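Write out the bound-state structure for magnesium ion.
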Amino acid sequence: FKFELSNILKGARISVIYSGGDDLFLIGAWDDVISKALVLRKAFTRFSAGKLTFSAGIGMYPVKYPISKMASETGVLEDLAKRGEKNQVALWNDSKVFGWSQLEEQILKEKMIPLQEALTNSQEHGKSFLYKMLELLRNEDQINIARLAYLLARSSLSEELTQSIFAWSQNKQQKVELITAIEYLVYQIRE
Amino acid sequence: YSEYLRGEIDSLEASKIAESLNLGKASLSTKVSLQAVDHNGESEPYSVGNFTFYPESGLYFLAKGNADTIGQLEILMHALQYSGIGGKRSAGYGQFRCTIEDSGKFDSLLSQTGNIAILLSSAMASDEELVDCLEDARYLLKKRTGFVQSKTYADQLVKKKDFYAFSAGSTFYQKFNGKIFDVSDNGRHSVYRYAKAFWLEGKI
Amino acid sequence: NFARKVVEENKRVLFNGLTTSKLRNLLELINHVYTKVYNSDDTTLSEDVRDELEYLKVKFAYESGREPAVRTFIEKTYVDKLVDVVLKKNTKKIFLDYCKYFEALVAYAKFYR
Amino acid sequence: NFARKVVEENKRVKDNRGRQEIVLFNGLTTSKLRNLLELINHVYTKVYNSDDTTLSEDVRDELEYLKVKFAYESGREPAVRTFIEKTYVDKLVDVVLKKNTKKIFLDYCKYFEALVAYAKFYR
Amino acid sequence: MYSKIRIVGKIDVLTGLHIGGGAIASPVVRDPYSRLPIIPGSSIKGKMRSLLAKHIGDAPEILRLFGSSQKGAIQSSRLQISDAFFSKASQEEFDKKDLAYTETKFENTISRLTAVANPRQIERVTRGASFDFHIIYNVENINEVMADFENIKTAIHLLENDYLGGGGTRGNGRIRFVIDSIDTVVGDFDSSNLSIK
Amino acid sequence: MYSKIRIVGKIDVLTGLHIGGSPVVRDPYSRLPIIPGSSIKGKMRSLLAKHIGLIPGQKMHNQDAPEILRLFGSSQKGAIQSSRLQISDAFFSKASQEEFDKKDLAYTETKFENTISRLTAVANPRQIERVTRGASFDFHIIYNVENINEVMADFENIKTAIHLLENDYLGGGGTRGNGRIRFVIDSIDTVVGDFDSSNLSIK
Amino acid sequence: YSKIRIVGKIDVLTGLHIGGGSPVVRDPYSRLPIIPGSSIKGKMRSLLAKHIQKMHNQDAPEILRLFGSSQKGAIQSSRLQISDAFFSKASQEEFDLAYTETKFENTISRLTAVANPRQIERVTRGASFDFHIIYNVENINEVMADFENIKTAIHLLENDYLGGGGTRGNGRIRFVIDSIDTVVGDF
RNA sequence: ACGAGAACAUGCGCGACAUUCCGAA
Ligand SMILES: [Mg+2]
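---
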């Protein structure tokens, strides 16, 4: 905790408020924070030989946000992650408590990367189209699934990608991952 | 409750109880102040931390006293529904409706006798009772602070004297009767801090 | 759903070569009648709306006669029989359900293209 | 509309030299009916332009010419005569003249369009 | 002795209302639990205070109405304006017609130099919506009730001719007040003669 | 003593009006075509700025003439000027709705265009939604009387803006024959205050 | 910045045909045929560009100056605004004779000589449309030259057709200018 | 005599710029 964290977090916009005992408090750029949280999980799995697991809470706040509120809400997220198997990471709210491999692979390496690569070609980066996808995904109507299918048809992107997105939205526990990936991409392309 | 006092609540049961509370959602509303804009200035945002209750959730409490005190509290609560409790009452917070009734479910517990006493309110005893009521006690000191909300206490708004009170849930083997302390510092009127003890007896 | 099943069954070219340009007239008539119903606040379809639905049915027949792809679309999707059902029940909810069914049909047809 | 049964009765199937023609009558050619169809087209375009709730006198004169053309077409081919007999177009033009209203004329035009549309669909 | 008058009613959204506050471009403020659009009581209080300050012109009457923290003359706020929540009748009406509670408005900004339109998305509350508003007037002095209520009437008139949130100079936030009831809930004061709007 | 002047009236469409939202903007509640007040305010401000005079190398709307900043508002730090003109959304009028229900119009039309390449001469087709010519919209404007002495002059400016808008379009591609409109003012009355607005006019 | 209005008449010498999605373009409100301003603007722009590229936004500088340009970094406002030409009320009263007539073309093939008849709806000759054009004075000095170009375009449009198949006798028109006045400004 | 009292998430901002429903008989 007191030595290896500096080596792990190398080359990231991150300040370590504390690191000792078994707890850890980091504040930085949100994308850097999530990437280094995944890297820390991997390095901790390597260090403890798989015998020890840790849970995490990641909050995203504006600058000038109350620091006490930041700490309290991130602690609430962490305590949310410490439930049941308690080997989880909470992301930005109580409805995004994922597993570590689920967040790294099933959310970022599987859903966010293909969509980001496809939407980089778009002139507007797909901000409005991603907003429409979020609007359609939040609702839970079958006719709205039809609207989502029409939007994917009119997206003018890879057909296999539209099929994958439609399947992901159809499946529960994969629609939450899809929504998280869409929101992460929206945050990445913004001002 | 009693099962917890007898030690028959497991750690998993404690976690289930903790997650079974369905009070509500705490949020932070960001507001702005445009008063400086009209004076060639800038807007000043601020934050108000609110808590909204679920449709059938709320806050209850127990009142003890004679018939006259109970009736006066009925009128006071009826007016307090529209006065509001908490922070920005005049800015759209703290409005509620209250119902006052009997409590058989709580009279079953308040008639219970035991070897330990549990505080149901933030209380503290005078020195004479504090001499003998603190043995084998398990408590939690809370620092009661704040500004005096009054239009006649002084010219400008000032804080009241720092107070320290035992928390709710503190267990004592001696039941102390608290009082209403004065946290006023040479003001026009005496600012009161209620620290009387509402007790719940139990078996450990 | 049913629209997904029928569009998948007719997918190979969809509905023997159906496109949105073939359907555009029926879509325009359907959304015009839909907006006229939407503006009104009544549980029952009015008389002029009933006559407009009869006109929509005859337009369905005319488009089926004109094009083979439109004809097989109408035959497979039961849209004319659904219009008859809406006329028989004369309920705004049933008409809105039929409009949603048609919209889902068009959306899925565009999706599998 | 109720033109479905009329067109169903008026619909027949022809076969010759291994070729199966789905035509209601032998003489029910699209142009032969289309002459009167375009006469009614002129009539109802004039009605649309006028935008009056009553059937105009000039529309009434073109309509009388329409009845003359109906008799002309009945004389021209027995198939058109039998179609007109089955559909009773003469009774509809008579009611259109008598009640003398735009809505009745529009309903009759829609019914006749329904007849021709069902005929085309059954082909 | 001490009186409190309850003024309940409806705020009808004449034009799309945007009060700032998943990922949505310029989202509106919402109830944390029901995720329903709301009109914060602070917004209404501040807008009416600004309109009344423009009308009268802080002035003493503004201090009586909306309270003051000024040193020496600490005034209690006579008006407690609660948050306006999405009406239940409007909720049922919007559940019918399959209409969402909030709409997305697309706007341009044409540059004065390159003549290039920058797009921008905002969120508004749909024009058919209504909000249940609840106000408590505290009678700290009985002699100023008429003056306070005529000031409230002037503020409500100005607000009905003004907007309530967002950019209303570009056709947003127009609202109308319908006063369902004005009844004295606390005390003996007779509010039958009193009226707002 | 605050004064608000209420100018109500009709915007009568002369050529098909297309304000994008190629569909047009519609009020979600009534599903009728709408004219956003942002469009009207922006077009009026742009026309008035061009007519009065545009500073060379101008980049922000806050660098407009003092009259434009006085009327349509400025957001420059320190010199924050509140906009006197509040242009509301123009909703599809009920009279036009009744007139369109007769003769069975759909409140809207689809116009078919094509783009012909200079070399290949290939006409790529397209469709744009427009508001029918006979349609009318209820326009509502609120003028905030902040300075008395600058009321009349300000109204003159507004009049000029209207005189530029009647000779211009309102949305979509009006250089190709869209968005042409006419303003007919039903009333100009002092809705709030004691101001005398009888002599004021913008057309 | 002055707005000059050109108001006049376009009288068709042959069958005017604009192929609205063979029907002709009609105003939904009045059910009368109209000449879209987009058609006129495109015809004048094409003829003037021919008299004077893949992107269609390159053209020649006078073309972008007059009819507008969406060039990246060189967005030029269009000084010419061509509005929809609506059927004249005087011509409508003169016809009150259908406004539009159908023309039949056999379209015989070459090798097999098999006719494939078709019908095209075209406005009858002698019909008139009131046309309205707006010119914005962006620069005072160039206006003369701009109007010169405009005149040339008009001449070309009088020698050419407008909409439909003009190589077979469609779309021929004539321009009668009524007045050219500075409606807005002091020009 | 309620960590309380005062505090508008608000000011500026056109969904707009170029586009022949055209070649063919
Ligand atoms: Mg720890």
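---
The CA atoms of residues 41 and 83 of chain E lie 4 Å apart.
The longest helix of chain E spans residues 41-56.
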